[PDB]
Amino acid sequence: AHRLIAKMPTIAAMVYKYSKGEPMMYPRNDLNYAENFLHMMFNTPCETKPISP
Amino acid sequence: DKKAQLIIEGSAPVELPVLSGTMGPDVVDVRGLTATGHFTFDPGFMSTASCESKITYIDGDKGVLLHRGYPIEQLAEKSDYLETCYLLLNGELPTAAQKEQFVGTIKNHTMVHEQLKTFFNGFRRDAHPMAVMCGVIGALSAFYHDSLDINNPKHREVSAHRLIAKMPTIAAMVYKYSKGEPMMYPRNDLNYAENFLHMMFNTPETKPISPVLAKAMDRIFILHADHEQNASTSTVRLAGSSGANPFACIASGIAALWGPAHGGANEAVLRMLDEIGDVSNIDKFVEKAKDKNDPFKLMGFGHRVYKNFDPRAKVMKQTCDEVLQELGINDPQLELAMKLEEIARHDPYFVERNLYPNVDFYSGIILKAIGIPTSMFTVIFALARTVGWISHWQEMLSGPYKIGRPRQLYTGHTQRDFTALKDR
Amino acid sequence: DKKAQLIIEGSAPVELPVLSGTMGPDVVDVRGLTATGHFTFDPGFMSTASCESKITYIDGDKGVLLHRGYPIEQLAEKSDYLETCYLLLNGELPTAAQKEQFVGTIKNHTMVHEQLKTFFNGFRRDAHPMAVMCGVIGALSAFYHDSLDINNPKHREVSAHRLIAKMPTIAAMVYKYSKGEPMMYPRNDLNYAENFLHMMFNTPCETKPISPVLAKAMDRIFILHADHEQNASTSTVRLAGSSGANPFACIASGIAALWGPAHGGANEAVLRMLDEIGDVSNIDKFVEKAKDKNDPFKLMGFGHRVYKNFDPRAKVMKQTCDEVLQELGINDPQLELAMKLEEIARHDPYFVERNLYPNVDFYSGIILKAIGIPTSMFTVIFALARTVGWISHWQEMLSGPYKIGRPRQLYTGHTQRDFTALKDR
């Protein structure tokens, strides 16, 4: 259950980043669940800017 | 207004309309010739005007090169590469608003589609950078083609932006690949030149870029932005006239530029310095050059167009001296080069022959000094010229063009029947 | 022998040497113009002769197209593609010995370097075949460059062979890739055309034999597209090559140019016409729709801008089409439609009098479709055939004394003006 709840966001992000043809992003332990998701979704290794609360 | 009578001696006289321009020479309209049953003969098109243009004007005798009316030396001294890009594309210099928006868009398109990474894996790491470029950006066609309406100016505009933005990223990938180092991504907090140098030399330690080197690079880009009609530029136009995809046309341009005759001066001047080897035997090779009988001649001295002086030369000298001020001329080949320069400038033979150290000599030295290998020199050229090519393509298409079928002079055999295997 | 006086009105008269050729019109040497401070003006170079050539001669008015003196119809009727390749490259037809050796070499170079397979994986499978070709053979440069001495005729020769041999294999790989099928290798026991069709349609699942009718039809299609004098693509190859550029790169430039709808999209156009018709039932509808001057609809693949009266290739192409459809048996309603449209066009007074005859492009489009090639590939087949022409024209100019082409322009832009700084705008 933990594995699923934890990985699903990372995978969902990978799908989006893949469709776009952008490089896939890794998670960050210093961001909460929602923040992390949005980071993995829209941020890049180009510029890692902070997420709107 | 004016007319020109052509009397062929065999045929009757024909009226050819002579057209003038904003500046430069007048031109004689020869489109009527095929009607009278003749062609003009022009190996290399050296006396034939392909088109109307209002992008870049050149007058070698006077030492004049100007983009949209602005002299190259002024742009190089004052503006930056992206401002010059805007000028070449849009026809006037930008406002702060126009500039902001343009730079923004260019920064938006800088990242390259991850699929392309696997493309490079189809090359040998020792493969020629220009071959890699020719292939890679030739393949970009496949990625930006389905939407692309060649006749829609919005599509032309976005295609130009895409090219200007991606070319540095790709050029960097070529270098990083040849080295066997991991390929670097762009950074929105760095300017064009800075970004290029970052992608080139930094790794996943990310140390800051020298403003001196960055500025020098930017100037090099400005000074190679466009150079009127030439092998590559005209190849882009000729290919493009069929209604061909822009990226493909640029790939044609790179193929043409790769040719040693078109873009290998930077390499040539370095091979000269290799041939010299040591400072100790500079005089030896100076006399060897001066010897009419000896195939040796100095490279990067004088110019076939800008006979008296190249307006870019001064600015390039400044930049070279400024770069070597920071780096220190550690290399003995660089030391050799600056001595050769000293000699050439303060020597009566070279002075009287108008054999001044040119843009290619200085730029070769700079690029080498700041760490670019000779193999890449032509890729840096291509990088800078891209904006010129696409600007000329944009102009051609924005006007009312025509496919473009060059004629020939037939000197082969007369019509003959098929000689059976027995006769041969 | 002859001279031509050019009077500019603004300037004093100038003497231009008028040069003649083995056949065709005379030419007026304008290289002296830049000395007098003028240029010629020629959008599209339609009245400007780029060079001397002895490869292909054309006279549209007379319906004449001949390679090395040999008419296209004779070559198409008698010789094969590789014999025609030898002709275009070497200047005369081969002996049995010369032929044997040439075919042998071509068969030696047919296999492609395994590294290139991974190149295709950098494309989308739905990507345009011509884009893929432009990229792939553009990358070949990297593989055959280090040895390659552009000035050495042996290197030129082997480069030409490599190209003529590999292009089919590559073209096949493009198709097999788009489909998502496994890419096929060549076979030394099959002739050029046979081999191509094998690589195209056969699988490692079942390697069944190739129709001699289809193979022969394909071969003739190749012959009839081998070279066509100076044109967008051919001249692009020459212009690029003039800088001393790698041959493979120059061919890549040619493919880029040919891709242009204007240069090489007639085969596609004629098919789009048949799509627009749709059914046989409404042929008459679209016939009148075409005849309507006011209506943007016009028939595609009928008549020709050069070969106004007749195309010498048309007859042989008709023969080939009828022969192919004899074997396959017009299963497709679009093919049925096409042959009816042909019947009409030929036996109709309007089209007869307008010289709107079914042309090489119409017939070849139908054939290629009938034998299974998708419309996307049509231009790749063109490129395949033309490769030999391009490299022959490249070989010719390089073998001659050449000067880096640097055309001129007519400046109609701003006049010298100072740089206004960013804060003054």
UniProtKB/Swiss-Prot annotation, chain B:
Q: What is this protein called?
A: Citrate synthase
Q: Which gene encodes it?
A: gltA
Which family does the similarity line name?
Answer: Belongs to the citrate synthase family.
What does the further note read?
A: Citrate synthase is found in nearly all cells capable of oxidative metabolism.
Name the Gene Ontology biological process terms.
tricarboxylic acid cycle
- Subunit structure, interactors included: Homohexamer.
Q: Record's InterPro entries? A: Citrate_synth-like_lrg_a-sub, Citrate_synth-like_sm_a-sub, Citrate_synthase, Citrate_synthase_AS, Citrate_synthase_bac-typ, Citrate_synthase_sf, Citrate_synthase_typ-I
- Enzyme Commission identifier(s): 2.3.3.16
**GO MF terms, alphabetically ordered:** citrate (Si)-synthase activity; citrate synthase activity
Give the activity regulation note.
Allosterically inhibited by NADH.
Origin species, per record, is Pseudomonas aeruginosa (strain ATCC 15692 / DSM 22644 / CIP 104116 / JCM 14847 / LMG 12228 / 1C / PRS 101 / PAO1)
> GO CC: one term?
cytoplasm
| Pathway(s) it belongs to | Carbohydrate metabolism; tricarboxylic acid cycle; isocitrate from oxaloacetate: step 1/2
Listed under catalytic activity are:
oxaloacetate + acetyl-CoA + H2O = citrate + CoA + H(+)
